[PDB]
Amino acid sequence: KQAAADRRTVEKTWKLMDKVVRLCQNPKLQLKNSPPYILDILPDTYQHLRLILSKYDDNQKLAQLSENEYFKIYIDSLMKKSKRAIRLFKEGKERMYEEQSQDRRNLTKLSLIFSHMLAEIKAIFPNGQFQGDNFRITKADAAEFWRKFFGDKTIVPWKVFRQCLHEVHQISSGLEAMALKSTIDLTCNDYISVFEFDIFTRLFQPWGSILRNWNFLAVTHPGYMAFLTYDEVKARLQKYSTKPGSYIFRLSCTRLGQWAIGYVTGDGNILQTIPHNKPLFQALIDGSREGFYLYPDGRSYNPDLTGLCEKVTQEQYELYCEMGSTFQLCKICAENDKDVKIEPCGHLMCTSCLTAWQESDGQGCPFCRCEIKGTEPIIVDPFD
Numbered sequence: 001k002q003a004a005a006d007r008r009t010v011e012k013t014w015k016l017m018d019k020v021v022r023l024c025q026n027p028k029l030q031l032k033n034s035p036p037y038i039l040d041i042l043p044d045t046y047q048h049l050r051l052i053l054s055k056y057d058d059n060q061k062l063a064q065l066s067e068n069e070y071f072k073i074y075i076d077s078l079m080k081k082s083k084r085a086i087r088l089f090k091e092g093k094e095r096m097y098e099e100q101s102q103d104r105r106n107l108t109k110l111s112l113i114f115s116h117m118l119a120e121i122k123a124i125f126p127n128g129q130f131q132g133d134n135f136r137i138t139k140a141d142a143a144e145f146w147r148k149f150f151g152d153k154t155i156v157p158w159k160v161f162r163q164c165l166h167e168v169h170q171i172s173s174g175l176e177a178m179a180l181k182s183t184i185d186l187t188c189n190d191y192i193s194v195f196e197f198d199i200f201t202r203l204f205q206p207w208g209s210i211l212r213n214w215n216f217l218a219v220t221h222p223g224y225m226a227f228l229t230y231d232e233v234k235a236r237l238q239k240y241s242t243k244p245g246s247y248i249f250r251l252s253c254t255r256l257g258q259w260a261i262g263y264v265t266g267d268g269n270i271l272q273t274i275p276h277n278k279p280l281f282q283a284l285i286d287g288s289r290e291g292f293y294l295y296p297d298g299r300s301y302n303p304d305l306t307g308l309c310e311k312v313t314q315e316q317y318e319l320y321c322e323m324g325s326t327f328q329l330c331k332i333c334a335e336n337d338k339d340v341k342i343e344p345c346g347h348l349m350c351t352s353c354l355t356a357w358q359e360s361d362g363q364g365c366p367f368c369r370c371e372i373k374g375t376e377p378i379i380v381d382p383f384d
C-alpha cells in the first residue's frame with residue numbers, strides 16, 4: 001500500500017531526481033553523451049509531471065489524481081529508483097568513474113528503467129491527462145485477455161498477472177517465470193501496466209503462441225541482442241562486415257514495442273529494417289528466403305523458425321536473467337521477494353516457500369540439501 005500521490009509526494013521525487021542529475025553531471029562519468037541519456041530523461045520526466053499537475057489544476061482535480069492507482073505506483077517507483085541511483089554513487093565511489101564496473105552497469109540498468117518509465121507515463125497520461133482506462137492494446141486477442149482478467153485496470157501486481165497468464169499460456173518453472181517477469185516488467189516495479197503488456201504482446205505476437213515466440217526469439221536465439229543503440233549494432237556487426245547476410249535483432253528504448261533488424265548488405269554496409277505490425281519470426285523467415293538474413297550474430301547456423309508458424313533449460317533462463325533486476329525475487333515461486341536466509345548455507349527464498357518446504361520435504365535446504373540449523377529474516381536489493 002503506497003502513499004497517496006499528493007503534490008508534496010510528487011515534489012519529493014523532483015528533489016531526489018535533481019540529486020541524480022547533479023551526481024550524473026560529473027565530467028569523469030562522461031554521461032552527457034551516454035545513451036539512453038539520463039541527463040535528458042530526468043528533466044523530461046520532471047516536465048511531464050509538471051504537465052500532469054497543470055491538467056489537474058484544482059483541489060478536486062488533485063484529489064482524483066492522488067487517488068489514481070497507476071499514478072500512486074508511478075510516484076512510489078520513481079522515488080525508489082531515484083534513491084537507488086543516489087545509493088549507487090554513495091557506495092560505488094571511484095568505481096562510478098570506471099565505465100566497465102558493475103556499479104556503472106547498474107547505473108545503465110536504472111537509466112533504462114527511467115527511459116521506460118518516461119515512455120509509460122507519456123502513454124498513460126498523454127498531454128498530462130489520464131487515459132489509462134481508455135488505453136488501446138494493439139493486439140485484439142491480447143486486449144481480450146486483459147479485459148477478461150483485469151477489467152478496466154491500468155496496472156496489476158506481477159503476482160496476479162502471472163497467475164492469470166498461466167491460466168491461458170502455461171509457465172513451466174520458477175526460472176521461466178523470473179525470466180518472463182524481467183521481460184514484461186520493464187519498469188522493474190513488481191507491477192504490469194497495460195502499456196508494458198501492450199509492448200510485450202506486440203514484440204512476441206501472435207498471442208496464441210506468445211510464450212513459444214518469446215522462448216524461441218528472446219531466450220534462445222543467437223541473433224537476439226536486447227536493447228542496443230545503432231552504434232552498438234554497428235560495432236557488433238563490424239567484425240562480420242566481411243560476411244553478407246550476417247544479422248542481429250534488437251530492441252530500441254526510443255521505439256518500444258518494435259524490433260530493429262540490423263544486417264550486412266551484399267556490398268558490406270550495415271543497414272537496419274523495422275518490421276511491420278507482424279511477427280518477428282515471419283520477417284526472419286522472409287528475409288532468410290530472400291538471402292538478406294542468413295547468419296545470426298555472424299554464425300553459420302540459422303535456427304529453423306517455421307515451427308512457430310504451425311525445450312529451454314534452467315541454465316538458459318538463468319543466463320537470460322543476468323541483465324534484469326530479479327535477484328531480489330524468490331527463485332522457487334517467482335512471485336514474492338526473498339525475505340529469509342537459510343543458515344548455515346545462506347540460500348535465500350520467500351517465507352511462504354520455506355514454510356511450504358518445511359511442511360513438505362524439509363530434509364535440508366531446497367537448493368543445497370544442507371541441514372537447516374536456522375533461518376534469518378533479510379532484505380534483498382536487486383543489485384546484490
Ligand SMILES: C[C@H]1CCCN(Cc2cc(C(F)(F)F)c3nn(-c4cccc([C@]5(c6nncn6C)C[C@@H](C)C5)c4)c(=O)n3c2)C1
Nearest residue numbers: 035036105108109182183226227228229320321323324325
Ligand atoms: C541502450 C544501450 C546503452 C548502453 C548499454 N547498451 C547495452 C546494454 C546494457 C545493459 C546493462 F546491463 F548494462 F544495463 C542492459 N540491460 N538490458 C536489459 C535490462 C533489463 C531487461 C532486459 C531484457 C533482457 N534481454 N535479455 C535478457 N533480459 C532480461 C530485454 C527486456 C525486454 C528484458 C535487458 C539491456 O538490454 N542492456 C543493454 C544498451
Ligand code: NA
Nearest residue numbers: 185187189191
Ligand atoms: Na512494471
Ligand SMILES: [Zn+2]
Nearest residue numbers: 330333350353
Ligand atoms: Zn517463494
Ligand SMILES: [Zn+2]
Nearest residue numbers: 345347365368
Ligand atoms: Zn542451501
